[PDB]
Amino acid sequence: ECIENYAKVNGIYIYYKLCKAPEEKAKLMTMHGAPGMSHDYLLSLRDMTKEGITVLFYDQFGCGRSEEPDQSKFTIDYGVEEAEALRSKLFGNEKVFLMGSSYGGALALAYAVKYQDHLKGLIVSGGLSSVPLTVKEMNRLIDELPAKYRDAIKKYGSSGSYENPEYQEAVNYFYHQHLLRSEDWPPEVLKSLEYAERRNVYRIMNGPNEFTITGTIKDWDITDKISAIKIPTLITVGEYDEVTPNVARVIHEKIAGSELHVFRDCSHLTMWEDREGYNKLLSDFILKHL
């Protein structure tokens, strides 16, 4: 069991779990992202503590166990200031590594652009620098789905009938194909998904589901700013990832010296489909840049 607490960061109380390693060779901060509205689905990275890598988990504002601030603060920029306040409060002036998953990756990209001086490295897994590009790419995935499921999405989706039984069925199929492929969904994942359908941030910022984005960040795009990131960067993405490897390619091209890895047979939550290989790829990256 790691250390858990409820600290006041940037105005509201945030929950965090710091899993220290016997020998702290490095510190790693993690940022979850939709559809997973909590750190729970990222606990599989706890294994790295055996490589001398301390891992910090926490629930961002309005998510998981953390309290919800005002709606006017449901922005990526706000999330950036929150992360910096937490990092400083726990590690002071120590430079740490930052890993981001899904929309947490987009958050990690925004953070790096303004605070890269506090990072020794950046890790983006299934992340993105543009929402419009992510939505465009996810629309292609829909058309690649078998007729039955594809027609359910387009039909009931065009009228906003998200409660439709066949619509819900297609969504489940889509996720089991681009979220967590050929694998038994672990409790950690079900927990993070449950938080999404319970809180408000998801619906407000994102929308009904992954391929149906209508929230306040549907226009978010810092592709013309990530080139300013000049630190060792690792980018991972799955072959069948809901956030296509074409989206990752864009990030890989704006960030000089970045490394791109496309995991075959895997999707979005690659840390559960290839737990050993994933953790081994990240730890090796971390240990090479102390």
Short mmCIF file of all heavy atoms in Angstrom, two decimals, residues 187-213:
data_model
loop_
_atom_site.label_atom_id
_atom_site.label_comp_id
_atom_site.label_asym_id
_atom_site.label_seq_id
_atom_site.Cartn_x
_atom_site.Cartn_y
_atom_site.Cartn_z
N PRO A 187 -10.77 -4.50 -12.75
CA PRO A 187 -11.53 -3.62 -11.87
C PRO A 187 -11.05 -2.17 -11.93
O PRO A 187 -11.86 -1.24 -11.91
CB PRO A 187 -11.31 -4.25 -10.49
CG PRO A 187 -11.17 -5.67 -10.80
CD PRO A 187 -10.27 -5.67 -12.01
N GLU A 188 -9.74 -1.98 -12.02
CA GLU A 188 -9.20 -0.62 -12.09
C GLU A 188 -9.80 0.16 -13.26
O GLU A 188 -10.07 1.36 -13.15
CB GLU A 188 -7.67 -0.66 -12.23
CG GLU A 188 -6.89 -1.14 -11.00
CD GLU A 188 -6.91 -2.66 -10.80
OE1 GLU A 188 -7.50 -3.40 -11.61
OE2 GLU A 188 -6.31 -3.13 -9.81
N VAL A 189 -10.02 -0.52 -14.39
CA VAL A 189 -10.59 0.14 -15.56
C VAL A 189 -12.07 0.42 -15.37
O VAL A 189 -12.52 1.51 -15.71
CB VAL A 189 -10.41 -0.71 -16.83
CG1 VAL A 189 -11.18 -0.06 -17.99
CG2 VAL A 189 -8.93 -0.82 -17.18
N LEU A 190 -12.81 -0.54 -14.83
CA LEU A 190 -14.25 -0.37 -14.60
C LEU A 190 -14.48 0.77 -13.61
O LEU A 190 -15.48 1.50 -13.71
CB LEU A 190 -14.87 -1.65 -14.04
CG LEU A 190 -14.73 -2.90 -14.93
CD1 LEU A 190 -15.26 -4.11 -14.18
CD2 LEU A 190 -15.48 -2.69 -16.24
N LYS A 191 -13.57 0.92 -12.65
CA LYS A 191 -13.69 1.98 -11.66
C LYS A 191 -13.52 3.35 -12.31
O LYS A 191 -14.34 4.24 -12.11
CB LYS A 191 -12.64 1.80 -10.55
CG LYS A 191 -12.86 2.67 -9.31
CD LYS A 191 -14.15 2.28 -8.59
CE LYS A 191 -14.34 3.05 -7.29
NZ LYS A 191 -13.19 2.87 -6.36
N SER A 192 -12.46 3.51 -13.09
CA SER A 192 -12.23 4.79 -13.76
C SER A 192 -13.38 5.15 -14.68
O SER A 192 -13.73 6.33 -14.79
CB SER A 192 -10.94 4.76 -14.58
OG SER A 192 -9.80 4.85 -13.75
N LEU A 193 -13.96 4.16 -15.36
CA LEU A 193 -15.08 4.42 -16.27
C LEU A 193 -16.32 4.78 -15.48
O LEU A 193 -17.13 5.58 -15.94
CB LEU A 193 -15.36 3.20 -17.17
CG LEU A 193 -14.27 2.83 -18.19
CD1 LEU A 193 -14.51 1.43 -18.71
CD2 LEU A 193 -14.26 3.84 -19.32
N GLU A 194 -16.48 4.20 -14.29
CA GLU A 194 -17.65 4.49 -13.49
C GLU A 194 -17.66 5.94 -13.04
O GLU A 194 -18.71 6.59 -13.01
CB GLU A 194 -17.71 3.58 -12.27
CG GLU A 194 -19.10 3.36 -11.77
CD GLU A 194 -19.08 2.86 -10.36
OE1 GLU A 194 -18.11 3.18 -9.65
OE2 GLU A 194 -20.04 2.15 -9.97
N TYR A 195 -16.50 6.46 -12.68
CA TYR A 195 -16.39 7.84 -12.27
C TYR A 195 -16.84 8.81 -13.36
O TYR A 195 -17.42 9.86 -13.07
CB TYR A 195 -14.95 8.16 -11.88
CG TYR A 195 -14.58 7.78 -10.47
CD1 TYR A 195 -13.53 6.89 -10.22
CD2 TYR A 195 -15.25 8.33 -9.39
CE1 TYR A 195 -13.16 6.56 -8.91
CE2 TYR A 195 -14.90 8.01 -8.08
CZ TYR A 195 -13.86 7.13 -7.85
OH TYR A 195 -13.49 6.85 -6.55
N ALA A 196 -16.57 8.46 -14.62
CA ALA A 196 -16.94 9.32 -15.74
C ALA A 196 -18.43 9.53 -15.84
O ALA A 196 -18.90 10.64 -16.07
CB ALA A 196 -16.40 8.74 -17.05
N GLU A 197 -19.18 8.45 -15.67
CA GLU A 197 -20.63 8.51 -15.74
C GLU A 197 -21.26 8.98 -14.43
O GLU A 197 -22.48 8.95 -14.27
CB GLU A 197 -21.18 7.14 -16.12
CG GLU A 197 -22.66 7.11 -16.47
CD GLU A 197 -23.10 5.74 -16.94
OE1 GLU A 197 -22.75 4.76 -16.25
OE2 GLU A 197 -23.78 5.64 -17.99
N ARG A 198 -20.43 9.42 -13.48
CA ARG A 198 -20.95 9.91 -12.20
C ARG A 198 -20.67 11.39 -11.97
O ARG A 198 -21.50 12.10 -11.41
CB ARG A 198 -20.38 9.10 -11.04
CG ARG A 198 -20.89 7.68 -10.96
CD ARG A 198 -20.40 7.00 -9.69
NE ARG A 198 -21.06 5.71 -9.50
CZ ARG A 198 -20.98 4.99 -8.39
NH1 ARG A 198 -20.27 5.42 -7.36
NH2 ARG A 198 -21.62 3.83 -8.31
N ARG A 199 -19.49 11.84 -12.39
CA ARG A 199 -19.11 13.24 -12.23
C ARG A 199 -19.70 14.09 -13.35
O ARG A 199 -20.60 13.64 -14.06
CB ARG A 199 -17.59 13.39 -12.20
CG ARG A 199 -16.88 12.48 -11.19
CD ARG A 199 -17.50 12.55 -9.81
NE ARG A 199 -17.37 13.87 -9.18
CZ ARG A 199 -16.32 14.27 -8.46
NH1 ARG A 199 -15.29 13.45 -8.26
NH2 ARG A 199 -16.30 15.48 -7.94
N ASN A 200 -19.17 15.30 -13.52
CA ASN A 200 -19.68 16.22 -14.52
C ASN A 200 -18.66 16.67 -15.55
O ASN A 200 -19.02 16.92 -16.70
CB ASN A 200 -20.25 17.45 -13.83
CG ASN A 200 -21.34 17.10 -12.83
OD1 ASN A 200 -22.39 16.59 -13.21
ND2 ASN A 200 -21.08 17.35 -11.55
N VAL A 201 -17.41 16.79 -15.13
CA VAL A 201 -16.33 17.23 -16.00
C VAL A 201 -16.36 16.56 -17.37
O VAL A 201 -16.34 17.23 -18.40
CB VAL A 201 -14.95 16.99 -15.36
CG1 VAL A 201 -13.84 17.36 -16.33
CG2 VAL A 201 -14.83 17.82 -14.08
N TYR A 202 -16.42 15.23 -17.39
CA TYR A 202 -16.47 14.49 -18.64
C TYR A 202 -17.54 15.02 -19.61
O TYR A 202 -17.25 15.45 -20.72
CB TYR A 202 -16.75 13.01 -18.35
CG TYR A 202 -16.67 12.13 -19.57
CD1 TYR A 202 -15.46 12.00 -20.27
CD2 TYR A 202 -17.77 11.40 -20.01
CE1 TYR A 202 -15.36 11.17 -21.37
CE2 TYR A 202 -17.67 10.56 -21.13
CZ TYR A 202 -16.46 10.45 -21.81
OH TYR A 202 -16.30 9.64 -22.91
N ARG A 203 -18.80 14.98 -19.17
CA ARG A 203 -19.90 15.44 -19.99
C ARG A 203 -19.72 16.89 -20.43
O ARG A 203 -19.97 17.23 -21.59
CB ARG A 203 -21.20 15.26 -19.21
CG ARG A 203 -22.40 16.00 -19.75
CD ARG A 203 -23.62 15.63 -18.92
NE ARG A 203 -23.42 15.86 -17.50
CZ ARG A 203 -23.40 17.06 -16.92
NH1 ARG A 203 -23.58 18.16 -17.64
NH2 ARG A 203 -23.19 17.16 -15.62
N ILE A 204 -19.28 17.75 -19.51
CA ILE A 204 -19.08 19.16 -19.83
C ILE A 204 -17.89 19.42 -20.78
O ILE A 204 -18.03 20.11 -21.79
CB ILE A 204 -18.84 20.00 -18.55
CG1 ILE A 204 -20.01 19.82 -17.56
CG2 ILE A 204 -18.67 21.45 -18.92
CD1 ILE A 204 -21.34 20.28 -18.10
N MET A 205 -16.73 18.88 -20.44
CA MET A 205 -15.53 19.09 -21.24
C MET A 205 -15.49 18.25 -22.51
O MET A 205 -15.24 18.77 -23.59
CB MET A 205 -14.28 18.79 -20.41
CG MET A 205 -13.94 19.88 -19.40
SD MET A 205 -12.34 19.62 -18.61
CE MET A 205 -11.26 20.23 -19.88
N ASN A 206 -15.76 16.95 -22.38
CA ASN A 206 -15.71 16.04 -23.51
C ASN A 206 -17.08 15.86 -24.19
O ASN A 206 -17.37 16.52 -25.19
CB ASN A 206 -15.17 14.68 -23.06
CG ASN A 206 -13.78 14.78 -22.43
OD1 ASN A 206 -12.80 15.12 -23.09
ND2 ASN A 206 -13.69 14.46 -21.13
N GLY A 207 -17.90 14.97 -23.65
CA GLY A 207 -19.20 14.74 -24.23
C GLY A 207 -19.77 13.38 -23.86
O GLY A 207 -19.30 12.76 -22.91
N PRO A 208 -20.77 12.89 -24.61
CA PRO A 208 -21.42 11.59 -24.38
C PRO A 208 -20.43 10.43 -24.39
O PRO A 208 -20.41 9.61 -23.47
CB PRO A 208 -22.42 11.49 -25.54
CG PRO A 208 -22.78 12.93 -25.80
CD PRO A 208 -21.44 13.62 -25.71
N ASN A 209 -19.60 10.34 -25.43
CA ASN A 209 -18.62 9.26 -25.52
C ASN A 209 -17.34 9.70 -26.23
O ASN A 209 -17.20 10.87 -26.57
CB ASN A 209 -19.24 8.08 -26.26
CG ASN A 209 -19.81 8.48 -27.59
OD1 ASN A 209 -19.07 8.83 -28.51
ND2 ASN A 209 -21.13 8.47 -27.70
N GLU A 210 -16.42 8.77 -26.47
CA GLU A 210 -15.15 9.10 -27.11
C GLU A 210 -15.21 9.67 -28.53
O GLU A 210 -14.45 10.57 -28.88
CB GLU A 210 -14.23 7.88 -27.09
CG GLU A 210 -13.60 7.59 -25.73
CD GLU A 210 -12.97 8.82 -25.10
OE1 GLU A 210 -11.86 9.20 -25.54
OE2 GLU A 210 -13.58 9.42 -24.18
N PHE A 211 -16.11 9.12 -29.34
CA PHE A 211 -16.25 9.55 -30.73
C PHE A 211 -17.31 10.62 -30.89
O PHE A 211 -17.59 11.05 -32.01
CB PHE A 211 -16.55 8.35 -31.64
CG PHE A 211 -17.71 7.50 -31.18
CD1 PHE A 211 -19.02 7.86 -31.49
CD2 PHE A 211 -17.49 6.35 -30.44
CE1 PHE A 211 -20.09 7.09 -31.06
CE2 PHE A 211 -18.56 5.56 -30.00
CZ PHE A 211 -19.87 5.94 -30.32
N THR A 212 -17.90 11.04 -29.78
CA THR A 212 -18.93 12.08 -29.82
C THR A 212 -18.51 13.23 -28.92
O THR A 212 -18.99 13.35 -27.79
CB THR A 212 -20.29 11.55 -29.31
OG1 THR A 212 -20.61 10.33 -29.98
CG2 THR A 212 -21.40 12.58 -29.58
N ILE A 213 -17.62 14.07 -29.43
CA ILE A 213 -17.10 15.21 -28.68
C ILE A 213 -17.84 16.51 -29.00
O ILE A 213 -17.84 16.99 -30.13
CB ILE A 213 -15.60 15.39 -28.96
CG1 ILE A 213 -14.86 14.11 -28.55
CG2 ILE A 213 -15.06 16.59 -28.19
CD1 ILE A 213 -13.47 13.96 -29.15
#
